[PDB]
């Protein structure tokens, strides 16, 4: 697979590292919808609002099967560590019109 998962479940936003590469989710949007990182980087999404959200990569993007991230409540976080160069699109399971991508250089 093309990413590893440091936290299987959502975790508290207060425990996101200071350093971390963060994508906020707010107002029904990913607030960095075209994020550029490098091989080896960890990305952390943080839901900033009451409406639940996730991140969801369809089958074949990060692995043979889909990666459907866990449901994230307000001030919950979820991370992926990207290990292979490429561009990886995702959406929100609940709200598929909400889309983003991670461009891994
Ligand atoms: Cu959503």
From Swiss-Prot:
Coiled-coil region list: none
Binding site for Cu cation: 53, 92, 95, 98
UniProt entry tagged with the keyword Transmembrane helix: no
Annotated GO MF terms: copper ion binding; electron transfer activity
Cofactor(s) required for function per UniProt: Cu cation
Complete-protein stretch covered: 27 to 131 of 131
Superkingdom as given in the UniProt entry: Bacteria
Gene: mauC
Function according to Swiss-Prot or TrEMBL: Primary acceptor of electrons from methylamine dehydrogenase. Passes those electrons on either a soluble cytochrome c or to pseudoazurin.
Protein name: Amicyanin
Domain Plastocyanin-like: 1-105
């Amino acid at each position: 697979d093309k990413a590893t998962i440091p936290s299987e479940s959502p975790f508290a936003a207060a425990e996101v590292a200071d350093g971390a590469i963060v994508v906020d989710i707010a107002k029904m949007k990913y607030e960095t919808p075209e994020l550029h990182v490098k091989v080896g980087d960890t990305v952390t999404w943080i839901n900033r609002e009451a409406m639940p959200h996730n991140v969801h990569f369809v089958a074949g993007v990060l692995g043979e099967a889909a990666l459907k991230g866990p449901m994230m409540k307000k001030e919950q976080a979820y991370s992926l560590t990207f290990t292979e160069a490429g561009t990886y699109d995702y959406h929100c399971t609940f709200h598929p019109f909400m889309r983003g991508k991670v461009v891994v250089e």
